[PDB]
């Protein structure tokens, strides 16, 4: 939300994908290994919070026959106190995790970008909206090789330098 000024509702394939456009034609394909890493991490959070206590609590109150008021009042006072605390814990935990979920998603993008950028030596230059400019028409063999991190960083170089 800044230079990738929006996102692709069409990308039903995964979380993170490629969208190329050379002469050859079109393409949109998810990057599963970046998708998974993020997915694996939301998974991590969910296993730390879908969580089961092994702490039994019993009854100290009585709903059918009220206990003495004084002890009743201390008991209610304690319960209320401990409710305030857990409502606090719950809301903060949710807010804190959601910031970090968000912040970790974007950080998975910015880190995919800069790895593709680093594959493409000087054979290319950053557009300014999270897109890459090739100065040599790249075919669709050359594509899935940009994708499956193989593309040669000096074996297309010279040609593109010129342009």
């Amino acid at each position: 939300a800044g230079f990738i000024e929006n996102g692709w509702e069409g990308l039903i394939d995964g979380w993170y994908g490629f969208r190329h456009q050379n002469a050859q034609g079109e393409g949109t394909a998810a990057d599963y290994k970046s998708t998974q890493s993020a997915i694996d991490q939301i998974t991590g959070k969910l296993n730390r919070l879908i969580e089961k206590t092994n702490q039994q609590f019993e009854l100290i109150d009585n709903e059918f026959n009220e206990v003495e008021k004084q002890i009743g009042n201390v008991i209610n006072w304690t319960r209320d106190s401990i409710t305030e605390v857990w409502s606090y814990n719950a809301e903060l935990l949710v807010a804190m995790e959601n910031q970090h979920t968000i912040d970790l998603a974007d950080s998975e993008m910015d880190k995919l970008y800069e790895r593709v950028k680093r594959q493409l030596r000087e054979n290319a230059e950053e557009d300014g909206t999270g897109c890459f400019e090739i100065f040599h028409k790249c075919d669709d063999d050359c594509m899935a090789s940009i994708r499956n991190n193989t593309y040669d960083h000096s074996k297309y170089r010279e040609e593109a330098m010129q342009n």
Partner: protein, 314 residues
């Protein structure tokens, strides 16, 4: 070539350290609101007491005739339950209740008290059985003949078991000092009680009380716990309801109070009076007083946790 991330038409709003309402690809609920309106008991030894009240299972009113030696993992008290046939109440009643709830049930034992010089068979119409009866575990001690004296007596019971014994006696309070003597003869009456832990003693206190099952007398029930090998003695001279049998705790259980039906088709460890809470969620907004093994009660109706990334469209 361009690289990016997915998105959607309709996302879900969550909250963050920083923003209030931010949309996300996906989100999941964190606070349980879904209750099941039944006591889920699958796999658990359950005792629903119905008309028997919990303290009743010790003294034995007719309600509790089928519960005098029960065995549970899960004890359920009902609103309709009563501890009592002949109008009275328990001293330290809730503590006793809290004890019985986690006892795993009770095993009875004759204390073997024998009687010379008094009557033994006191009954009433509040406690119906075939006819007029009394508290099955208790004995209503009188003077031999329609008036006359009560011998200052002593009885002891030695707990010979490895477990703490639950001892219960009763003090009768008659409608009058007229009625008091007709039962046990005149003069101040005194019951005394001692163990190693324990030291106390009691007098009756006759006088009028509201009619409850048409009776105006009250029975005061009391209780203590004999440790192993420790011994208890009863100094008394009338106005007394002796323990026939003592009680031993079986093991371990949990006690709830509820008004919904049992269901051996679902499993549960978090209970409250209108049902079982089954949830994996860390939190709940259903009942602050739920007992068992439960998510934490929180005030909030809802707290959405992001499970997807930020959401921005075309």
């Amino acid at each position: 070539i361009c690289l990016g991330h997915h998105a959607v038409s309709n996302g879900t709003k969550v909250n963050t350290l920083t923003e209030r309402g931010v949309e996300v690809v996906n989100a999941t609920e964190t606070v349980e609101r879904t209750n099941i309106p039944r006591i889920c008991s699958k796999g658990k030894r359950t005792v629903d007491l119905g008309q028997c009240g919990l303290l009743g299972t010790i003294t034995g009113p007719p309600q509790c005739d089928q519960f005098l030696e029960f065995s549970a993992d899960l004890i359920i008290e009902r609103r309709e339950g009563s501890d009592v046939c002949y109008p009275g109440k328990f001293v330290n009643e809730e503590a006793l209740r809290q004890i019985l709830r986690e006892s795993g049930g009770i095993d009875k034992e004759a204390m073997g008290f024998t009687y010379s010089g008094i009557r033994t068979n006191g009954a009433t119409s509040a406690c119906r059985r075939s006819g007029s009866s009394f508290y099955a575990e208790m004995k209503w001690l009188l003077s031999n003949t329609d008036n006359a004296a009560f011998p200052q007596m002593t009885k002891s019971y030695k707990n010979t078991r490895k477990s703490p014994a639950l001892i219960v006696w009763g003090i009768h309070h008659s409608v009058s000092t007229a009625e008091q003597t007709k039962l046990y003869g005149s003069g101040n009456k005194l019951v005394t009680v001692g163990s190693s832990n324990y030291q106390q003693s009691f007098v009756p206190s006759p006088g009028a009380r509201p009619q409850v099952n048409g009776l105006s007398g009250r029975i005061d029930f009391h209780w203590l716990m004999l440790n192993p090998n420790d011994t208890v003695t009863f100094s008394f001279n009338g106005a007394f309801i002796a323990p026939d049998r003592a009680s031993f705790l079986r093991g371990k259980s949990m006690g709830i109070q509820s008004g919904v039906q049992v269901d051996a088709n679902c499993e549960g460890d978090c209970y409250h009076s209108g049902g079982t809470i089954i949830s994996n969620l860390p939190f709940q907004n259903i009942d602050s007083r739920a007992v068992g093994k439960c998510p934490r009660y929180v005030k909030q109706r809802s707290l959405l946790l992001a499970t997807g990334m930020k959401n921005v469209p075309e």
